[PDB]
Amino acid sequence: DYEALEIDTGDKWGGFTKDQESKLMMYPYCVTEITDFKGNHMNLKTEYINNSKLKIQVRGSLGVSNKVAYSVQDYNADSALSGGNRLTASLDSSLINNNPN
Amino acid sequence: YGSEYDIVSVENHKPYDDMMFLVIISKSIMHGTPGEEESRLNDINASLNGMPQPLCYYIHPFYKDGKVPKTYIGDNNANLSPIVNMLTNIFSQKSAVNDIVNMYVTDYIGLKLDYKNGDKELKLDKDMFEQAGIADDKHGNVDTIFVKKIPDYEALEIDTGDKWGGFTKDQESKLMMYPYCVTEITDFKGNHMNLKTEYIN
Amino acid sequence: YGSEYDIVSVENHKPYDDMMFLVIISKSIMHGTPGEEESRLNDINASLNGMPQPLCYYIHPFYKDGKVPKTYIGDNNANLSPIVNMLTNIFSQKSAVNDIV
Amino acid sequence: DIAILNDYLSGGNTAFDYGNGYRGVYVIKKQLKAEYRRSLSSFFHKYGYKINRVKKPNLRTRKAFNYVQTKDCFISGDINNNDLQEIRTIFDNGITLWHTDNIGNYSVENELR
Amino acid sequence: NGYRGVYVIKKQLKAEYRRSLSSFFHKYGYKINRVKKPNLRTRKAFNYVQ
């Protein structure tokens, strides 16, 4: 079986300048982008990451060519949604790199 | 109603649950079968498989740990090879491999099957399938399934239950309607569609 | 809220930090292993790798300066070749190269 | 497809999908965020739904109150026409009919009668 | 050139617009669009209500 590896990047609000007006922390005023700088990228509305931290799950394989996926399973997850269901549902909105390398 | 949805329910359904099929296609017959009086090796064999068609089809059910279900064809145990050993042996047989034109895996072969997922037991119609022994007397024997014919395909129904199950029920029922709620169906392989739940009749 | 964003934070995360893998796929067994009872060279060898599959997979961890990690398999040091030398040597061996897909 | 080990050998990643457990079909249910649920639910609670039908109005169908807003409504009666015109104007402008003595308390459920 | 793995890039609006919007919110609060009882005395110095 293949398995997911979790990368904990820490406090999801880390790095943003904190305004007196908290609404300026919301999309569209701020945004978190995830990219591989190889053509794959996605914008995350930080407020909708259901977790205090931004954690990224890495999935991959050892098949006939390179393929690695980067997910944020907590993005748009209902609070009651299990970790397993979150990981499952996150693939349609993941960074997927299938560069042959 | 905002810019994003919460994902509130996630469920997976597979046609044969834990079982998948390996499909092997060859230009001619590769196998012997118990009781046959004469060899059919290398014979062309056209058959009804969805439509009249000229290739030979072999199938092999398997599980992710490499085990295979106990499979009967009529009253006889087909004695299926474990799938990994079978791949090794089939590709080791020069005669077998030179005749094979495709190999793929599929979740559904166009038939409702007499299959017990819990017991890992499969029963197949002897009029449609037969035991296939593929051997060259040097490498390991392969025991698999030859498809004699599948005249028609059929639909298999998956019942997921109450279509409103999983949504939070608001005091205001209109908030159960699209665009406030939506049911998405996807294979997570690039195919997906949004359903307005209220319009599922 | 304007037409452009300021980039305020940039961070890079890699699954195995400094390490990546070279993956070599061949149609048959190219190697011997200490203790093996009989040679398996040129044998077909299917295996579970994500799914049941018929090819032979070799992997080689490496760093950007050409070093490789000290690697143990169980209790035994695998004595890995440095990656540059390995590329030179693997492609110098015709038996090896003709089987690599 | 799975690789065929013949003399011709040397696409797509079947292993990634199967090995990470993706098979069959998935049902994903999605709903609007809590912020917007609160907004919209409170609005519908007070003002009902958009209807866009020509019909007799729902005047007394809920337990506590009914909101009614018409356009070009038809109202007749043995009433001087000045007052009838004023009454039609009232409903065309929108009015809440209270069926309880606790007028103005919107915290109640207001379930169907 | 050193590109491996995944990158997290955080982005925010320019100072010109931060000044604009924060001064506006400071005076007039936020758009609410909710049916509810009004916030009359929830801040230390003043409450805008519309």
String of DSSP letters for E32-48? ----S---SS-SSS---
- Alpha carbons B185 and A6: distance in angstroms, whole number: 27
Please, are residues B168 and A81 in contact by the beta-carbon 8 Å criterion? no
Q: Kindly report the three-state secondary structure assignment for every residue of chain C.
A: CCCCEEEEEEEEECCCCCCEEEEEEECCCCCCCCCCCCCCCCCCCCEEECEEECCEEEEEEECCCCCCCCCEECCEECCCCCHHHHHHHHHHCHHHHCCEC
CA distances from residue B50 to B74, B131, B154, D9 in whole angstroms, order as listed: 22, 21, 10, 30
Greatest Cα-to-Cα distance within chain C, rounded to the nearest angstrom = 72
- Alpha carbons B118 and B116: distance in angstroms, whole number: 6
Beta strands, E only, chain A: 5-11, 30-35, 41-44, 53-59, 68-71, 95-97
Six token digits for residue B17: 């649950």
C94 CB-near residues (< 8 Å, 6+ apart): none
- Alpha carbons A37 and E4: distance in angstroms, whole number: 9
The neighbour count for residue D48, using CB atoms within 10 Å, is 20
E49 CB-near residues (< 8 Å, 6+ apart): E38, E39, E40
Q: Which of A20, A21, A35 sits opposite E9 (nearest CB)?
A: A35
Please, are residues A51 and A38 in contact by the beta-carbon 8 Å criterion? no
Kindly list the residues from chain B whose CB atom is less than 8 angstroms away from the CB atom of residue D109: 171
Report the relative pairing of strands B181-186 and D25-32 from DSSP bridges.
Answer: antiparallel
CA angle centred on D21, ends B90 and C24, rounded to 5°: 55
Kindly list the residues from chain A whose CB atom is less than 8 angstroms away from the CB atom of residue B5: 76
Q: Is B117 helix (H, G, I), strand (E, B) or coil?
A: coil
Q: What are phi and psi of B149, to 5 degrees?
A: -170, 145
Q: Is D65 helix (H, G, I), strand (E, B) or coil?
A: strand
Q: What are phi and psi of B176, to 5 degrees?
A: -90, -10
For chain D, the 3-state helix, strand and coil shares in percent, each to the nearest 5, are 30, 15, 55
Question: Whats the size of chain C, residue-wise?
Answer: 101
For chain B, the 3-state helix, strand and coil shares in percent, each to the nearest 5, are 10, 35, 55
Q: Residue B90 region, left (φ>0) first, then alpha (ψ -120 to 50), else beta?
A: alpha
CA distances from residue B169 to A75, B139, B198, D27, D110 in whole angstroms, order as listed: 22, 62, 14, 18, 17
DSSP A27: T
C8 touches chain A (CB under 8 A): yes
**Residue in chain A lying closest to D1 (CA):** A64
Tokens 């044969």 locate to: B16
At residue A88, what is the residue type? T
B104 CB-near residues (< 8 Å, 6+ apart): B22, B23, D1, D2
Q: What are phi and psi of D85, to 5 degrees?
A: -65, -40
Q: Is the peptide bond before C82 cis (omega within 30 degrees of 0)?
A: no
- Alpha carbons B2 and C22: distance in angstroms, whole number: 45
Under an 8 A CB cutoff, do C8 and E17 touch? Answer: no
Task: List all chains that touch chain B, counting a touch as 3 or more CB pairs closer than 8 Å.
Answer: A, C, D
Smallest CA-to-CA distance from B58 within B33, B34, B36, B39 is with B33
- Alpha carbons D38 and A47: distance in angstroms, whole number: 17
Q: Residue D24 region, left (φ>0) first, then alpha (ψ -120 to 50), else beta?
A: left
Smallest CA-to-CA distance from C55 within C69, C44, C66 is with C44
CA distances from residue B17 to A4, B14, B61, D23, D62 in whole angstroms, order as listed: 23, 5, 12, 9, 48
- Alpha carbons A46 and B71: distance in angstroms, whole number: 52
- Alpha carbons B26 and B20: distance in angstroms, whole number: 20
For B:19-48, CB contacts with D below 8 A are 20, 22
**H helices of B56-133, where?**
83-92, 94-97
Kindly list the residues from chain D whose CB atom is less than 8 angstroms away from the CB atom of residue E35: 42-43, 45-46, 106
In which element (H, E) is residue D26 found? Answer: strand D25-32
- Alpha carbons B82 and B151: distance in angstroms, whole number: 28
Greatest Cα-to-Cα distance within chain B, rounded to the nearest angstrom = 74
- Alpha carbons D5 and C101: distance in angstroms, whole number: 11
Smallest CA-to-CA distance from D27 within C87, E35, E42, B197 is with B197
Report the relative pairing of strands C20-26 and C47-49 from DSSP bridges.
Answer: unpaired
Q: What are phi and psi of A40, to 5 degrees?
A: -105, 130
Six token digits for residue A75: 């993005």
Q: Kindly report the three-state secondary structure assignment for every residue of A74-87.
A: CECECCCCCHHHHH
B94 CB-near residues (< 8 Å, 6+ apart): B136
CA C21 distance to own-chain centroid: 5
Under an 8 A CB cutoff, do E8 and A54 touch? Answer: yes
User: How many Cβ pairs closer than 8 A exist between chain B and D?
Assistant: 126
Six token digits for residue D29: 């249910």
Residue C31 burial (CB < 10 Å; 0-12/13-18/19+)? exposed
Q: Is the dihedral of CA C34, C38, C44, C46 positive or negative?
A: negative
**Residue in chain B lying closest to C54 (CA):** B87
Six token digits for residue C77: 């040091």
DSSP B66: S
The neighbour count for residue B44, using CB atoms within 10 Å, is 11
First to last CA, chain C: 53
Q: Is D29 helix (H, G, I), strand (E, B) or coil?
A: strand
- Alpha carbons E22 and E7: distance in angstroms, whole number: 29
